[PDB]
Design an enzyme around this catalytic site. Sequence first.
Site, PDB file in Angstrom:
ATOM      1  N   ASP A   1      58.932 121.644 -30.557  1.00 18.70           N
ATOM      2  CA  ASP A   1      58.154 121.940 -29.356  1.00 18.70           C
ATOM      3  C   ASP A   1      57.089 123.040 -29.505  1.00 18.70           C
ATOM      4  OD1 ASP A   1      57.453 122.540 -26.626  1.00 18.70           O
ATOM      5  OD2 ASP A   1      59.391 121.724 -26.013  1.00 18.70           O
ATOM      6  N   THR A   2      55.834 122.662 -29.724  1.00 21.10           N
ATOM      7  CA  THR A   2      54.790 123.675 -29.875  1.00 21.10           C
ATOM      8  C   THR A   2      54.419 124.414 -28.574  1.00 21.10           C
ATOM      9  OG1 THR A   2      53.013 122.021 -29.668  1.00 21.10           O
ATOM     10  CG2 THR A   2      53.821 122.554 -31.888  1.00 21.10           C
ATOM     11  N   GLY A   3      54.808 123.863 -27.432  1.00 23.86           N
ATOM     12  CA  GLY A   3      54.496 124.520 -26.168  1.00 23.86           C
ATOM     13  C   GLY A   3      55.561 125.519 -25.751  1.00 23.86           C
TER      14      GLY A   3
END
Lengths: 99, 99
Positions: free
Chosen positions: A25-27
Site C-alpha cells: 500500500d503506497t498510500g
Amino acid sequence: PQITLWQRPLVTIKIGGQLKEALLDTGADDTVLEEMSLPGRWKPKMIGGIGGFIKVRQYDQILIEICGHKAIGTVLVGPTPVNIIGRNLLTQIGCTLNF
Amino acid sequence: PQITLWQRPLVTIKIGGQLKEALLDTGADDTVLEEMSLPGRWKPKMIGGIGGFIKVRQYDQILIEICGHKAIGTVLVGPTPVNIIGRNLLTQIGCTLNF
Ligand SMILES: N#Cc1cccc(S(=O)(=O)N2C[C@@H](O)[C@@H](Cc3ccccc3)N(Cc3ccc(O)cc3)C(=O)N2Cc2ccc(O)cc2)c1
C-alpha cells in the site's frame, strides 16, 4: 519483481514465523496488521483513515519478511480491512513506483 | 520516472479543468477525490477502510491527467481526507511496483 496493478498488489509476508497475505500500500504511511500476537511492549498511536481516526497498538523493531525481503520496523495492530504494508516497510525493501 | 517512497507519492492531476494534488495509492481499488462537481450521471457508493466507511458519488468515464498522462476512468467523489488516485487509473498510466 515488477508488479502491475490490474489486481490488488497482494503478497505473502512472514511474521512470527507465520505466513500471511498482505497489501503493498503506497498510500499508507504505516504498516497496519490484523489482530495478532507480537512480542514486547506496545505504544499507543492514532492513524487517520478514509472514515476517521482510530487507535492502534504500535510495536517497534519487529521482524517481518515481505515477499522474500527481510525488514525490521514499526508494525501497528488494529481493526483493518486487510494486512497493510505501508511506506515505512516498502522503503526498507526498496520498493518504488514506476511509469 | 521512478518514484521512491520516503515521502507520500504526491502528484498533480488535472480534472474537470481543476488542478489538484493527489496520492498515488496502490492500496486503493478506486480513485476517490474530495467534494467536487463532475459532469454526467452518478450512482451512490459506500467505501471503507481505516476509520470506517464514507458515502461517495460514482462517476464513470471521467477524463483525468496524471503526471502528464491522460487517462479515462471511474472517479468517486466524497468526504475523503485526501485525494486518492487508485488502481483503476494507475494501470492506465502503466504504473508499477518495483523492488
Ligand atoms: N486492497 C485493498 C483495500 C480495501 C479496503 C480498504 C483498504 S485501506 O483501508 O488500506 N485504504 C487504502 C489506504 O491506502 C489508505 C488511504 C488513505 C485514506 C485517508 C488518508 C490517508 C490515506 N487508508 C487508510 C490508512 C492510512 C494510514 C495507514 O498506515 C494505513 C491505512 C484507507 O482508509 N483506505 C480506504 C480506501 C478504500 C478504497 C479506496 O478506493 C480508497 C481508500 C485497502
